[PDB]
Amino acid sequence: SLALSLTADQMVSALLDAEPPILYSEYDPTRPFSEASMMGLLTNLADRELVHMINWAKRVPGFVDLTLHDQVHLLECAWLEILMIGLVWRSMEHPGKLLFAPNLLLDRNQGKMVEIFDMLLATSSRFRMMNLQGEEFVCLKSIILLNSGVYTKSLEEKDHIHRVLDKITDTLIHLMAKAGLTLQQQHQRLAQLLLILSHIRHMSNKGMEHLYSMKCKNVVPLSDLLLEMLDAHR
């Protein structure tokens, strides 16, 4: 009930304050590479980001109104999408490079994966040219959490998700209206943002396939939580 009561400015305010921190990797420039080390680094990094993501989700308006079973499902579905849009957001001001961590800044010339890399690069490039705002980003990330697993007894729950989804929509429009955008510009920008979500979904799916391949090839370890998350998709 709390989520639907909030104003658009209160919604934004709430999402901003729920923002997880930017974590560091264990990268060391004086340390050798290979595919093992890098994927190990990113796995380690992702695993710690998950713990922050889980507590971030609980602060997303309406998320705790859901059953634990539903919360689990949404996260299992969305976790990589959410990491990736995080990755893309903080990589904006670094064209042609991905900022996995403040101390882990990678180009395409250190890969192999290279296509997932390029896709993330394109998406970042898209955010940059759109001049994506922080308030827009947090709205987008929350939408991903609620939307991505909603179309997979009672629910009820499902319709409640559509209400808060609908409330994040006027919020976005509300944001674009104060920016000085005309109605036509608002609709168009809204559409541009939401179409990006299809690409983020696509990258997530291609990513899981690479991750599942990585697990079966038992090359460098996945954490217990990351394994459980990955198994949900397989």
Partner: peptide, 9 residues
């Protein structure tokens, strides 16, 4: 279930 835990706790 690890994820189930962390949501609870």
């Amino acid at each position: 279930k690890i994820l189930h835990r962390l949501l609870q706790d």
